[PDB]
């Protein structure tokens, strides 16, 4: 390897504490130093505009998931648990295990199970504005609404639902390098990973679920019964902790600027893209690598086989050479094509449940509160793929 010869190089950490309580500064310096940038700080490629993020994403057998989609490369290092069978795959295989997904979550599914997602977040609303509306946006609704109806649609049981979001966010922090928050989760880990290791087994999901659902194929030969625990082991990893973090991004766009609250107000049918503008605005999902399987060009960049490349989603979904007026929260911009769910194959599976989740409280908001105002300090959460905050204070004034 030639470590970079021909490119710009920089020594921004995208996984210090620094930089996530503040990225917009250096994901411009990124933006800026070219199309394509060495990272001295951990040894990888990077790319943080639109074009090249969208080119590599939509490039997956150049720039592969099999290697793994964290910093670790899976050939040069054993896995910090076995090789999730669709995100850390590349087609063929990835063709199937995404196919069984992408029917269990499908849009006819979502339609049989809105009313009751709309019934939890109708309720929902209700509970805090009784309380007075003084509450806290994380805690009682981006924290609680998803609490309120996904474990319940996956099938699981009650009890150790506790493990869950830690789960998410070990999962989260082990995409990133060998820095603290890594080190810790996964010392902390056990007992977080023997829950999800349980509960995905097949007599641990009540019938009717998502779980079950995936169960069900190995009935039929689509796949088979060790693969099954794996496909649930997808959705207790990502189906969570991302919904917390896009209905939180909502709620604080929402909060910090009145007049697209009032805009939703005025024509609710915005909901949907008022919730899709804040995944583009906020990106709560910032990162995620990719390892090339040969020598490429890649905007006039030499990239050895065997490299790891880091594309940074959340500025993608910022930069000014594609999108008109990238910091405005705006609940009527095109968003189509923006990155925050990804792109090309392996293109958020879930985004359905996602959007049904953020859509649904964002009506209820819509039809029930008159204005929403921030009402005490902020604290943020520090992660090494998800961005998000710890505590949203807010005051919601009834309609
Ligand atoms: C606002 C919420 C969400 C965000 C921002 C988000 C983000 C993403 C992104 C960026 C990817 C692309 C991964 C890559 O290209 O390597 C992805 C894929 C994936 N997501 Fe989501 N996600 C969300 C919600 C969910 C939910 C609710 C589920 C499950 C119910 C889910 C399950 C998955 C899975 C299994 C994949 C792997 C798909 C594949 O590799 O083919 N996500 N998501
Ligand atoms: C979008 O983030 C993830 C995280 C984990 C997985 C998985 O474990 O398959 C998928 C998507
Ligand atoms: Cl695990």
Same mark, same amino acid.
Request: aromatic fraction near 8%.
């Given at each position: 390897?030639? &470590?970079?010869?021909?490119?710009?190089?920089?020594?921004?950490?995208? =996984?210090?504490?620094?930089?996530?309580?503040?990225?917009?500064?250096?994901?411009?310096?990124?933006? @800026?130093?070219?199309?394509? !940038?060495?990272?001295?700080?951990?040894?990888?490629? +990077?790319?943080?505009?639109?074009?090249?993020?969208?080119?590599?994403?939509?490039?997956?057998? %150049?720039?592969?998931?099999?290697?793994?989609? +964290? $910093?670790?490369?899976?050939?040069? @290092?054993?896995?910090?648990?076995?090789?999730?069978?669709?995100?850390?795959?590349?087609?063929?295989? &990835?063709?199937?295990?995404?196919?069984?997904?992408?029917?269990?979550?499908?849009?006819?599914?979502?339609?049989?199970?809105?009313?009751?997602?709309?019934?939890?977040?109708?309720?929902?609303?209700?509970?805090?504005?009784?309380?007075? +509306?003084?509450?806290? *946006?994380?805690?009682?609704?981006? @924290?609680?609404?998803? $609490?309120? !109806? =996904?474990?319940?649609?996956?099938?699981?049981?009650?009890?150790?639902?506790?493990?869950? $979001?830690?789960?998410?966010?070990?999962?989260?922090?082990?995409?990133?390098?060998?820095?603290?928050?890594?080190?810790?989760?996964?010392?902390?880990?056990?007992?977080?990973?023997?829950?999800?290791?349980?509960?995905?087994?097949?007599?641990?999901?009540?019938?009717?679920?998502?779980?079950?659902?995936?169960?069900?194929?190995?009935? %039929?030969?689509?796949?088979?019964?060790?693969?099954?625990?794996?496909?649930?082991?997808?959705?207790?990893?990502?189906?969570?902790?991302?919904?917390?973090?896009?209905? *939180?991004?909502?709620?604080?766009?929402?909060?910090?600027?009145?007049?697209?609250?009032?805009?939703?107000? *005025?024509?609710?049918?915005?909901?949907?893209?008022?919730?899709?503008?804040?995944?583009?605005?906020?990106?709560?999902?910032?990162?995620?690598?990719?390892?090339?399987?040969?020598?490429?060009?890649?905007?006039?960049?030499?990239?050895? @086989?065997?490299?790891?490349?880091?594309?940074?989603?959340?500025?993608?979904?910022?930069?000014?050479?594609?999108?008109?007026?990238?910091?405005?929260?705006?609940?009527?911009?095109? %968003?189509?094509? &923006?990155?925050?769910?990804?792109?090309?194959?392996?293109?958020?599976?879930?985004?359905?449940?996602?959007?049904?989740?953020?859509? !649904?409280?964002?009506?209820?908001?819509?039809?029930? !509160?008159?204005?929403?105002?921030?009402?005490?300090?902020?604290?943020?959460?520090?992660?090494?793929?998800?961005?998000?905050?710890?505590?949203?204070?807010?005051?919601?004034?009834?309609?």
């Amino acid at each position: 390897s030639q &470590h970079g010869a021909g490119v710009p190089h920089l020594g921004i950490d995208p =996984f210090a504490l620094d930089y996530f309580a503040d990225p917009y500064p250096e994901q411009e310096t990124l933006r @800026e130093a070219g199309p394509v !940038v060495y990272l001295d700080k951990w040894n990888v490629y +990077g790319v943080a505009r639109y074009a090249e993020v969208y080119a590599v994403l939509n490039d997956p057998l %150049t720039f592969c998931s099999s290697r793994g989609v +964290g $910093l670790s490369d899976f050939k040069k @290092e054993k896995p910090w648990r076995p090789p999730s069978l669709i995100l850390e795959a590349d087609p063929p295989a &990835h063709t199937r295990t995404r196919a069984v997904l992408s029917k269990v979550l499908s849009p006819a599914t979502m339609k049989r199970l809105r009313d009751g997602f709309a019934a939890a977040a109708d309720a929902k609303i209700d509970e805090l504005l009784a309380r007075g +509306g003084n509450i806290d *946006a994380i805690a009682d609704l981006a @924290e609680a609404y998803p $609490l309120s !109806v =996904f474990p319940d649609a996956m099938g699981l049981k009650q009890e150790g639902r506790e493990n869950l $979001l830690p789960y998410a966010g070990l999962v989260f922090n082990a995409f990133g390098p060998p820095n603290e928050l890594r080190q810790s989760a996964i010392e902390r880990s056990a007992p977080h990973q023997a829950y999800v290791a349980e509960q995905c087994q097949r007599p641990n999901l009540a019938p009717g679920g998502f779980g079950a659902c995936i169960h069900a194929f190995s009935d %039929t030969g689509e796949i088979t019964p060790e693969e099954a625990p794996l496909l649930v082991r997808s959705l207790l990893s990502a189906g969570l902790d991302t919904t917390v973090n896009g209905i *939180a991004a909502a709620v604080y766009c929402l909060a910090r600027f009145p007049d697209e609250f009032a805009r939703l107000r *005025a024509d609710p049918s915005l909901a949907r893209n008022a919730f899709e503008e804040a995944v583009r605005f906020e990106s709560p999902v910032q990162t995620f690598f990719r390892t090339t399987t040969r020598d490429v060009e890649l905007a006039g960049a030499t990239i050895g @086989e065997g490299e790891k490349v880091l594309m940074f989603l959340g500025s993608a979904n910022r930069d000014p050479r594609r999108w008109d007026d990238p910091d405005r929260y705006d609940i009527t911009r095109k %968003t189509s094509g &923006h990155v925050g769910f990804g792109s090309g194959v392996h293109m958020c599976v879930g985004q359905l449940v996602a959007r049904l989740e953020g859509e !649904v409280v964002l009506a209820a908001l819509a039809r029930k !509160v008159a204005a929403i105002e921030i009402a005490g300090p902020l604290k943020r959460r520090f992660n090494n793929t998800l961005r998000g905050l710890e505590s949203l204070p807010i005051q919601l004034t009834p309609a």
